[PDB]
């Protein structure tokens, strides 16, 4: 199974250096050569760098010059990649591409998952969760939804599961959007009759990898 | 010391275009806004070249043996420092004089040396982490190298968002050796860009061999470990005559293939690029000889010199038989076939030759004597045979046939 | 290097339809060009190389042409998950020359929303913060709009869209939209309501809640 | 893509009109030449 992974992405102040790895098996990283783009979100694509057997004989893009070095590695055979003058408006998802041949023109393969970049003198804050309540006097309408919001984490991401595994029915996830404070919010939701609200019991449970923060809510009515 | 690496993968050659570039100063004189009229080896316009890449489906590292033929048009597109020397010989063996031209680090080495070349023979660069710049490690091009001469050394041929396209001409002239290059900047990710240029002459070495054979010397990435990248293209050169327009700096702007098409050959013909509207008279076509059929006048008597040499009685050396033969075609060639005779031996005129040979009276003296006696047969021979019998006269002599008759 | 127009930037066409998107450059690449598809919250994938060439493990369906200057790049029978982002790229003066995207959507069967609102808890209320958000849930047409009102009077300049990604059973969105006050503003009113509207209802359909209780 | 036979030779690349026009290129015997 060929598989390229990224990680080191993450929180460099302006003018910090960093290497990005992109750990590689299941091929040969130098008979194929490794690429560099970046995903800006809500953007278009931006290639960096090429590397053919060495990272002597590259290429960088004219809106990248002198910012990010490629590099290779020996034996265990990853690939790195170093930044340096970062600049705010360059934020976005970076991905360690990869080819096949090269003598012929270069067209990319592997396309790995890509890893997320941003750059700010920010702090890092913890984040916090916001319940969707329903209402208690509700009767323009006989189904109601149950949610459960976490609101101003940063960054991504955050699961939920359901009442211990023996309930699994109406799972619905939202992609997430910014907020005014520069942090993240992300909603799960449901959509069912509400006869079964009170009569099947909902649990959402929220899971943050970044502070491995576990909390077990469950929806009740208001007084 | 040469290693063997039989996991070269074989596949029938690559093709594409090869446009009009392949253009080179023909002579080291300067010419300024000219139409000049040449007639050389060059590479004929849009032409097939074939297009050597180190590309994949089993990585296709390419790296094959390509006949030097009469000269060969080289262009590489390079970023990573691959291509990097040359194999010339018609054997390419240490049987047969052979040359290499190593653009190592740093130098440029030209050897026309007596080399015992690896079956599989190239460089090898291998990184270190302490410096940056590769280390030319591997080396393995010969197994030995002996009677060197002409061993010569220059400054290196100059390495140039851009890919620096290389593009190099060998020819052998007369013994010389003559390299033409030009380096230039270039988009296009493979194949060469639409535009034109020229190489200069740089060097004609005075190498004094043979070329028919030669061979890429290329860079390996050893992470044994292969690869490659990039791509180097080969043409032949042929005869053609080619007009160019040299401009006001000496620089050549445009070339033009007499050969290429009739429009071509018309501009060839005016010393001109744009033609009227109009009929034009450019060469002749004159059908060619499908054969040639060499007919020669039917058989007719022949000279009887089975009479003679199968006669039943031959007259006495004191009294030799001097038999004048004419009016007759001489078929020497069955005599001359027949392996009965112990020596033949024609003077002045070899056997192999003497068919068209035409003579106006033949006399044949037939005798026999001993084989000591034969070194009596000498322009003025001295002895007493010699002397107070059949002497053979000291001005030209004609041809001896004798064969052994003892029983 | 080479500028890429690629139209259109969005394209809504039903199941089994054709879609062909046009990928614009500059001078005669000719049949040198790929196409890569990328699913949202995915890495890229494969299409097709040299514009005429099926790789290992794409499906027969992906079909591509064009060649010089225009590309056509055309679905032959529309699947119900091919919702994605298509990217259009070459190489020649090295890709730096990439495109601005091109996004499809799926037309499909229509099927009415689900509707409800997400208050405030007293959770929430306790730390100073209230969002007031009411949700449409795979609502078909793919357009749809939500109205909040605050006694019973339009509001805006606080109000966001969430927007969920296709929906697999029927190739639809999710939109939830929020309102964002304090708790003496949402206090100080005594209705609140969020309408739907959609082409399968003749009427909209309001629903409300109150803080307070009042 | 076409050949003519005329009474002044044999003629590659152009191809024979029905109608007439006024002499552009001339050929021999009453044949003229683009268009």
């Known amino acids: 199974e060929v598989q390229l992974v990224e990680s080191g992405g993450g929180l460099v102040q302006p003018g910090g250096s960093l290497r990005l790895s992109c750990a590689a098996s299941g091929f040969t990283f130098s008979s194929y050569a490794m690429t560099w783009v970046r995903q800006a979100p809500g953007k278009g694509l931006e290639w960096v760098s090429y590397i053919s057997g060495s990272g002597g004989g590259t290429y960088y893009a004219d809106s990248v010059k002198g910012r990010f070095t490629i590099s290779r590695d020996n034996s265990k055979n990853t690939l790195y990649l170093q930044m340096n003058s970062l600049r705010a408006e360059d934020t976005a998802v970076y991905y360690c591409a990869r080819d096949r041949w090269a003598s012929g023109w270069l067209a990319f393969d592997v396309w790995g998952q890509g890893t997320l970049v941003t750059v700010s003198s920010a702090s890092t804050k913890g984040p916090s969760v916001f319940p969707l309540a329903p209402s208690s006097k509700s009767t323009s309408g006989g189904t109601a939804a149950l949610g459960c919001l976490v609101k101003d984490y940063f960054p991504e991401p955050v699961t939920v599961s359901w009442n211990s595994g023996a309930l699994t029915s109406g799972v619905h996830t939202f992609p997430a959007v910014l907020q005014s404070s520069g942090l993240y919010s992300l909603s799960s939701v449901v959509t069912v009759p509400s006869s079964s609200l009170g009569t099947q019991t909902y649990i959402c449970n929220v899971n943050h990898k970044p502070s491995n923060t576990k909390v077990d809510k469950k929806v009740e009515p208001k007084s | 010391q040469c290693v063997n690496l039989t996991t070269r993968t074989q596949l029938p050659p690559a093709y594409t275009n090869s446009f009009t570039r392949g253009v080179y100063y023909p002579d080291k004189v300067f010419r300024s806004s000219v139409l000049h009229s040449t007639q050389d080896l060059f590479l004929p316009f849009f032409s097939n070249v074939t297009w050597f890449?180190?590309?994949?489906?089993?990585?296709?590292?390419?790296?094959?043996?390509?006949?030097?033929?009469?000269?060969?048009?080289?262009?590489?597109?390079?970023?990573?420092?691959?291509?990097?020397?040359?194999?010339?010989?018609?054997?390419?063996?240490?049987?047969?004089?052979?040359?290499?031209?190593?653009?190592?680090?740093?130098?440029?080495?030209?050897?026309?040396?007596?080399?015992?070349?690896?079956?599989?023979?190239?460089?090898?660069?291998?990184?270190?982490?302490?410096?940056?710049?590769?280390?030319?490690?591997?080396?393995?091009?010969?197994?030995?190298?002996?009677?060197?001469?002409?061993?010569?050394?220059?400054?290196?041929?100059?390495?140039?968002?851009?890919?620096?396209?290389?593009?190099?001409?060998?020819?052998?002239?007369?013994?010389?050796?003559?390299?033409?290059?030009?380096?230039?900047?270039?988009?296009?990710?493979?194949?060469?860009?639409?535009?034109?240029?020229?190489?200069?002459?740089?060097?004609?070495?005075?190498?004094?061999?043979?070329?028919?054979?030669?061979?890429?010397?290329?860079?390996?990435?050893?992470?044994?470990?292969?690869?490659?990248?990039?791509?180097?293209?080969?043409?032949?050169?042929?005869?053609?005559?080619?007009?160019?327009?040299?401009?006001?700096?000496?620089?050549?702007?445009?070339?033009?293939?007499?050969?290429?098409?009739?429009?071509?050959?018309?501009?060839?013909?005016?010393?001109?690029?744009?033609?009227?509207?109009?009929?034009?008279?450019?060469?002749?076509?004159?059908?060619?000889?499908?054969?040639?059929?060499?007919?020669?006048?039917?058989?007719?008597?022949?000279?009887?010199?089975?009479?003679?040499?199968?006669?039943?009685?031959?007259?006495?050396?004191?009294?030799?038989?001097?038999?004048?033969?004419?009016?007759?075609?001489?078929?020497?060639?069955?005599?001359?076939?027949?392996?009965?005779?112990?020596?033949?031996?024609?003077?002045?005129?070899?056997?192999?030759?003497?068919?068209?040979?035409?003579?106006?009276?033949?006399?044949?003296?037939?005798?026999?004597?001993?084989?000591?006696?034969?070194?009596?047969?000498?322009?003025?021979?001295?002895?007493?045979?010699?002397?107070?019998?059949?002497?053979?006269?000291?001005?030209?002599?004609?041809?001896?046939?004798?064969?052994?008759?003892?029983? | 290097d080479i500028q890429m127009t690629q139209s259109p930037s969005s394209l809504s066409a039903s199941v089994g339809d054709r879609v062909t998107i046009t990928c614009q450059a500059s001078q005669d690449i000719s049949n040198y060009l790929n196409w890569y598809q990328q699913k949202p919250g995915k890495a890229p994938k494969l299409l097709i190389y040299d514009a005429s060439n099926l790789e290992t493990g794409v499906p027969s369906r992906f079909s591509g042409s064009g060649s010089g200057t225009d590309f056509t790049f055309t679905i032959s029978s529309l699947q119900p998950e091919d919702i994605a982002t298509y990217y259009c790229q070459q190489a020649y003066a090295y890709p730096l020359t990439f495109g601005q995207g091109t996004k499809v959507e799926i037309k499909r069967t229509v099927a009415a929303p689900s509707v409800f609102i997400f208050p405030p808890s007293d959770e929430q209320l306790k730390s100073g913060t209230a969002s007031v958000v009411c949700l449409l849930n795979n609502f078909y047409p793919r357009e749809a709009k939500v109205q909040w009102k605050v006694d019973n009077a339009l509001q805006s300049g606080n109000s966001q869209e969430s927007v969920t990604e296709q929906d697999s059973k029927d190739s639809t969105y999710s939109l939830s939209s929020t309102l964002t006050l304090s708790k003496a503003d949402y206090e100080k009113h005594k209705v609140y309501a969020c309408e739907v509207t959609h082409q399968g209802l003749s009427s909209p359909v309001t629903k409300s809640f109150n803080r307070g209780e009042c | 893509s076409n050949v003519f036979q005329t009474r002044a030779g044999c003629l590659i690349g152009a191809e024979h009109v029905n109608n007439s026009y006024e002499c552009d290129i001339p050929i021999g015997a009453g044949i003229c030449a683009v268009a």
């Open chain 2, 53 to 407: 890449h180190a590309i994949h489906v089993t990585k296709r590292f390419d790296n094959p043996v390509l006949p030097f033929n009469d000269g060969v048009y080289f262009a590489s597109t390079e970023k990573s420092n691959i291509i990097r020397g040359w194999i010339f010989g018609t054997t390419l063996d240490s049987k047969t004089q052979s040359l290499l031209i190593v653009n190592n680090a740093t130098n440029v080495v030209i050897k026309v040396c007596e080399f015992q070349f690896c079956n599989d023979p190239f460089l090898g660069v291998y990184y270190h982490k302490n410096n940056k710049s590769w280390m030319e490690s591997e080396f393995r091009v010969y197994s030995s190298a002996n009677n060197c001469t002409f061993e010569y050394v220059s400054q290196p041929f100059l390495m140039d968002n851009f890919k620096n396209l290389r593009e190099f001409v060998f020819k052998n002239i007369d013994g010389y050796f003559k390299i033409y290059s030009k380096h230039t900047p270039i988009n296009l990710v493979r194949d060469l860009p639409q535009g034109f240029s020229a190489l200069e002459p740089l060097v004609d070495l005075p190498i004094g061999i043979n070329i028919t054979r030669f061979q890429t010397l290329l860079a390996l990435h050893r992470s044994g470990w292969t690869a490659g990248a990039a791509a180097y293209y080969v043409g032949y050169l042929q005869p053609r005559t080619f007009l160019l327009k040299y401009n006001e700096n000496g620089t050549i702007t445009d070339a033009v293939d007499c050969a290429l098409d009739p429009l071509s050959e018309t501009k060839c013909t005016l010393k001109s690029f744009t033609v009227e509207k109009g009929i034009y008279q450019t060469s002749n076509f004159r059908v060619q000889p499908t054969e040639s059929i060499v007919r020669f006048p039917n058989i007719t008597n022949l000279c009887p010199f089975g009479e003679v040499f199968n006669a039943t009685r031959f007259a006495s050396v004191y009294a030799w038989n001097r038999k004048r033969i004419s009016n007759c075609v001489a078929d020497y060639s069955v005599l001359y076939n027949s392996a009965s005779f112990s020596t033949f031996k024609c003077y002045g005129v070899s056997p192999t030759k003497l068919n068209d040979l035409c003579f106006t009276n033949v006399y044949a003296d037939s005798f026999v004597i001993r084989g000591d006696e034969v070194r009596q047969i000498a322009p003025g021979q001295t002895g007493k045979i010699a002397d107070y019998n059949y002497k053979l006269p000291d001005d030209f002599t004609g041809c001896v046939i004798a064969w052994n008759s003892n029983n």
